[PDB]
Structure formats: structure tokens, C-alpha cells
């Protein structure tokens, strides 16, 4: 794979497919979407509008990171929607994982379609990677956009090589995949502000320590989950946090590798010392199969 | 340097004299302390000792059968076994408070034991009280004279006394086990389904830890059924129970820590649990030292 070649080629292919129309892209902060947004911006400048929807379920500091990288550094038109209270209010009382997924997917695409209308987008750019067993698209309230997918034939490692070349920050280039529903499926039972806070801070500790250990390039994913069961501490009851770390090619199968004991111990103690209301930290030692990667 | 052989002749002589012709009773927990006091006492007064094993259904897999073979068959003690499984399970229906679990189990055990105490007109309560590292009144009002042959020994001495008395290694070196048993290793309600998971999980843990020769280097190694659920793939996302593995070293009552366990052993225990015990979605390993955690999960 020649990243220099591919960029030149792909910038040219997009400009001609998109021609002079207005395009839109959802920035997750992940690598695939970040790479496609930057390729597209190179191809069409201010015709591109990027949208960041702050669902309140994102990793700590995402909004700022996306602003500083895409708006400040790179100069993309960037629309940011602070939708935290809206997504939290909607999840009040919801414990069914599938109801969480449906609610969050719906609010998300509704806000996205709203912005796409406001700006009269005609093209949707997505960072979809290969393969394609998984072209216009109709959005749920009827708006139709032509789809461009410049990474549609690329794999994980090719795209990491691309983001390097395009000068994206290291935090993006090696960003682990993160779900649409974000932290809401890493907080079992009800997504309260209390449990969401614990979740967000535990995940920041996991990310920081895994980065210090240079395991961010080897691991597929590495995260913390707030379980909806409690255990005892020094005798008071509080939240159990589970750590989840796996290797995988694509998320189809997964194995828990040998994680240095020191690293796990250090995470554990940072979590119980720095985050009030956590009694216990445990580590998931279940492969996929028979487990799924996420806990719900 | 403590002398087991001498202690046995001095103790057996002292037990005979404190007890006399009278009927004595003891609770067998399956632990080393009560096991030793029972055997000493049985050398002193033979058939005047009644040993009681209450099968609460909350003990480790195979416990009743090991007590039978060891104390009735091998040593010839008068053993009564009360099958109280249904009784303890029925009493814990709906009970999710850990304090209340502990209370219910404590008092119900006393009620079964006291019933036997009355039945057989016992006068003396032998206990396995040892040193830190006498009448009692039962609930209905029966009074027992307490005899504590081991009150002065430390755990290390008791263990030496137990080898000399012919007890198996399975008793002598067994990790300590809570009075309320598997009840405090099933979080939330103790249902029959969760308990059965807890029992087999613990048997898998004990077996694998022994096979890897780590029983020596660990204080406690057990499984807990958490009252929360995670996803598992079977065909097209099932919800099932999370089991947690707890392995600690500890040198005093204030502290414990999680040592480095070989990862192959962890993965082995994990893969056995999920493949062999229906309705477990995930196995997690506790990486919290004491402080800030406790050893048990509740
Ligand atoms: O965008 C997403 N929305 C979701 O609802 C969702 N659920 C799981 N995942 C991710 O997919 C992979 C497979 O996850 P599981 O083994 O938990 O099914 C893992 O990499 C998970 O993070 C999701 N991504
Ligand atoms: O006989 C008992 N009845 C109980 O209710 C009980 N709770 C905890 N333990 C045992 O005591 C030690 C310290 O327990 P924690 O660190 O969990 O507080 C550990 O070795 C525990 O196994 C119990 N033993």
C-alpha cells in the first residue's frame, strides 16, 4: 500500500464524483471518518460541512479534540451540536440495551438530518471501510443524499497509514473503535449522570495507562464498564467497574491477551483512588466467542 | 517448638476429666479447628460425643460426603447429618440484604443444632476455638458447658496436631470458608439456579488451582455469582450471569492483595466455567486489593 499514491488518487476521484455540490460528513473522532473528512476537504474545501454531535456519551474531551483538530488546525466548516441534555433526558429510566440503542440511533440521525437540511447537503461522505458485505441513501425523514466512500476498499492498517501521512494527530491515527451509542452501552442498567461520570473517568484512566504501556497499537479495544451490581469495600456497597481489553482483527472474534499484571493493578488503583463510589475493579477474561466484546 | 504427641496425651486426659461421664455435642464445619477438637474429644469419651454436620446446601461441592467418609467411616465418631438444604433455601427466598442473609443463616443453623442438642440431652458443647494469631445458653434455654481443647493453640500448631491425628490434607490445608458458605458468594437473592452455578464454579476453581500447585501460595481462591448480566454470542446475543473469580494472598486480618496469577490458569478456569456451566455469559477476575475492597463480594 502506497499512502502517497492513494491520497493523490482519492482526492481526484472525490472532486470529480462530488463535482460542485455541497457535502456532509459525521465526525465521530475516529480514524475512518477523520481520514475521509480530511481527504474530502482537500478535494472540495468549504463545500464540505463536518458535523459533530455531542451526544454526552462520548469519551472525555472529544468535543474539544474535534474542534481543535478539524476547526482550529485544519479549517473545516464544522457544526457542533451540544445535544448532551437531550440524549440524557431521553435515556432517563431506560434499562433495556436494545431500547438504549434505538433511542440514541434515532435522536442522532434526526439531529443529523436537521443539519443536512439546514445546509442543503446533496452528498453524504462516509468513512466506510472494506468489505462491502455489511448509490443514494434515504435518511429516515426522507432526505436523499448521494453517498461517497473513499475508504470502501481499504482495511484497518491501510487507513492508519493514511491518517499518518495526512498529519492527523496520533490520538486519531490510533484511536480505538468506539460505538454509536458510546458510553451508554458501557453503563449497564440506567444511564444516570452518576454512573456516566464514573464510566467516563474510568475510561480515561484506561486509555491513558494503555497509551503509557505502548499497547494502544496492539489492542483492538480497551475500555471500562460500570456494572449494575455492587460489591463491598473498606462495609459499604458501591459500583463494580469491569475492564475490557481485547485483540481482534475485525470485531468478529476476539481474544483477551496476557495484559501485564502491573498495568491492570495500576489501573485498578487509579480507579478506586481517583473515582469516588467505585468499590471494586474486575477484568474480563472471556474470549469472543462465547462472549461479545461489549457487556450489553 | 510445639509437640503434637505430648499435647494429644495432655489434652485427651484434660477432656475426659472436664467432661466426665456426660454427653457432649460438637458442630462439624469441615474446617480444621472443629475437625481436630472432634477427634481429640472422640479419643477422650468415645461414643459419648455426638458430632453434628448440618448440610445447609451452602457448603462446597462434596462437603457432606467428605465429612461422612472421614468422621463416620474412617474415625468411627457418632455422626448425625441433618439434610437442611430445602430448609435453608426456603428461608433465603426473596432475601437480598447481605446482613439479613448472614442473620437468617446464623439463627437457623443454631435452631437445627439446638434441636439435636435437646433430642440427645447434651450437656457439654465442644468448640474448636483456637488462640487469636464458660457456659452458653441456647435459644430455648438449654444450657451447655463449653469445652475448648484448642483455646491456646495457634493455627500453625493446630495444623500440626491434625496431621498427627490422621486427618486428610483436604481438611488440614483447606482454605478458610465463611460460616454462611456460598450464600455470600451469590450476590442478591440466593436462587437454586445461581447457587448451582456458584457451587460448580467453585469446584472448577479449587481443582484448577490445585492442579497448577497454587493452593500453597494463595490464602483464598473462589468464585462469585454477581447479580448482573452480560451478553454472550450463541448463533444470532443472550443475557446471562457474570461469575467473578477472587484470588488473594493475605498475612493478616486487615489486608489482602491480588498476586500475579499465571494467565493460562485464569483462561483455563474461565473457559471451563463458560463451556461447562449453563447460563454463564462472562468470567471476570477481581483485581482489587484490601484496602480498599473486602475479600468477599458482600
Ligand atoms: O457503532 C456501534 N453500535 C453499537 O450498538 C455497537 N455494539 C457493539 N459495537 C462494536 O462492535 C463490535 C462487536 O461488538 P459485540 O461483540 O459487543 O457485539 C465491538 O467492536 C463493539 O464496540 C457497536 N458499534
Ligand atoms: O465465617 C465467616 N462468616 C462471614 O459472614 C464472613 N464474611 C467474610 N468472612 C471471611 O472473613 C475474612 C475477611 O472477610 P472480608 O475481607 O470479606 O471482610 C475472609 O477470609 C472471608 O472469607 C466470613 N467468615
| β A77-82/B220-232 pair status | unpaired
Q: Which CATH number is A176-296's, of 3.40.50.280, 3.30.300.10, 1.10.357.10, 3.40.50.11540? A: 3.30.300.10
User: Which residues in A lie closer than 8 A to residue B243 (C-beta atoms)?
Assistant: none
3 state SS of B178: coil
Total length of chain A: 296
3 state SS of B294: coil
Give the residue from B224, B150, B161, B222 showing the smallest Cα distance to B187.
B224
Nearest-by-Cβ selection for B237 from A272, A282, A292: A292
Instruction: Tell me whether residues A292 and B234 touch, CB distance under 8 A.
Output: no
* DSSP assignments along B223-245, one per residue: EEEEEEEEEE-S---EEEEEEEE
Decide: B120 and B25 in contact? Cβ < 8 Å.
yes
CATH class of the region B1-174: alpha beta
Chain region(s) in chain B for CATH 3.30.300.10: 175-298
Phi, psi of A160 (to 5 degrees): -65, -45
Angle formed at CA A123 by CA A122 and CA A126, multiple of 5 degrees:
150
Give the residue from A227, A239, A258, A243 showing the smallest Cα distance to A293.
A243
* Rounded Cα distance, A154 and A149, in Å: 10
Alpha carbon dihedral B68, B70, B71, B75, in 10-degree steps, equals 140
Outline where A49-96 has alpha helix (H): 62-66, 84-91
Query: Technique behind this structure?
Result: X-ray
- At the fourth CATH level, the homologous superfamily of domain A1-175 is HUPs (3.40.50.620)
* Nearest alpha carbon, ligand 1 atom 23: A179
Is any atom of ligand 2 closer than 6 Å to the C-beta of B293? no
Chain region(s) in chain A for CATH 3.30.300.10: 176-296
User: Which residues in B lie closer than 8 A to residue A272 (C-beta atoms)?
Assistant: 288, 292-293
Cβ neighbours of residue A141 closer than 8 Å, sequence gap 6 or more: A110, A113
Decide: A232 and B296 in contact? Cβ < 8 Å.
yes
For A:269-288, CB contacts with B below 8 A are: 269, 272, 279-288
Decide: A272 and A281 in contact? Cβ < 8 Å.
yes
| β B24-27/B124-126 pair status | parallel
CATH architecture assigned to B175-298: 2-Layer Sandwich (3.30)
Q: Is the CB of A165 inside 8 Å of chain B's CB atoms?
A: no
User: Which residues in B lie closer than 8 A to residue A188 (C-beta atoms)?
Assistant: 228, 230
Instruction: Tell me whether residues B292 and A279 touch, CB distance under 8 A.
Output: yes
| β B49-55/B24-27 pair status | parallel
Report DSSP state, residue A73. Answer: I
From the CA of A101, the nearest ligand is 1
Chain region(s) in chain A for CATH 3.40.50.620: 1-175
Amino acid at each position: 500500500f502506497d499512502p502517497k499514491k492513494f491520497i493523490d488518487e482519492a482526492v481526484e476521484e472525490i472532486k470529480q464524483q462530488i463535482s460542485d455540490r455541497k457535502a456532509i460528513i459525521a465526525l465521530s473522532g475516529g480514524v475512518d471518518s477523520s481520514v475521509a473528512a480530511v481527504l474530502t476537504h482537500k478535494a472540495i474545501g468549504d463545500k464540505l460541512t463536518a458535523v459533530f454531535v455531542d451526544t454526552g456519551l462520548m469519551r472525555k474531551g472529544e468535543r474539544e479534540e474535534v474542534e481543535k483538530t478539524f476547526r482550529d488546525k485544519l479549517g473545516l466548516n464544522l457544526i457542533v451540536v451540544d445535544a448532551k441534555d437531550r440524549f440524557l433526558n431521553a435515556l432517563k429510566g431506560v434499562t433495556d440495551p436494545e431500547e438504549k440503542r434505538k433511542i440514541i440511533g434515532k435522536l442522532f440521525i434526526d439531529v443529523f438530518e436537521e443539519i443536512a437540511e439546514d445546509i442543503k447537503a446533496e452528498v453524504l461522505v462516509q468513512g466506510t471501510i472494506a468489505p462491502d458485505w455489511i448509490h443514494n441513501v434515504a435518511l429516515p425523514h426522507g432526505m436523499v443524499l448521494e453517498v461517497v466512500e473513499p475508504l470502501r476498499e481499504l482495511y484497518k492498517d491501510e487507513v492508519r497509514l493514511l491518517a499518518k501521512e495526512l498529519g492527523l494527530p496520533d490520538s486519531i491515527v490510533y484511536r480505538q473503535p468506539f460505538p454509536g451509542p458510546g458510553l451508554a452501552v458501557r453503563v449497564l442498567g440506567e444511564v444516570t449522570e452518576e454512573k456516566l461520570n464514573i464510566c467516563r473517568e474510568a475510561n480515561a484512566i484506561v486509555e491513558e495507562e494503555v497509551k503509557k504501556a505502548n499497547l494502544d497499537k496492539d489492542l483492538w479495544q480497551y475500555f471500562a464498564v460500570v456494572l449494575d451490581c455492587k460489591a463491598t469495600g473498606v462495609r459499604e456497597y458501591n459500583w463494580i467497574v469491569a475492564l475490557r481489553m481485547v485483540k481482534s482483527l475485525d470485531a468478529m472474534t476476539a481474544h483477551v491477551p496476557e495484559i501485564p499484571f502491573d498495568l491492570l493493578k495500576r489501573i485498578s488503583k487509579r480507579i478506586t483512588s481517583e473515582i469516588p463510589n467505585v468499590a471494586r475493579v474486575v477484568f474480563d477474561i472471556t474470549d469472543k466467542p462465547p462472549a461479545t466484546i461489549e457487556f450489553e
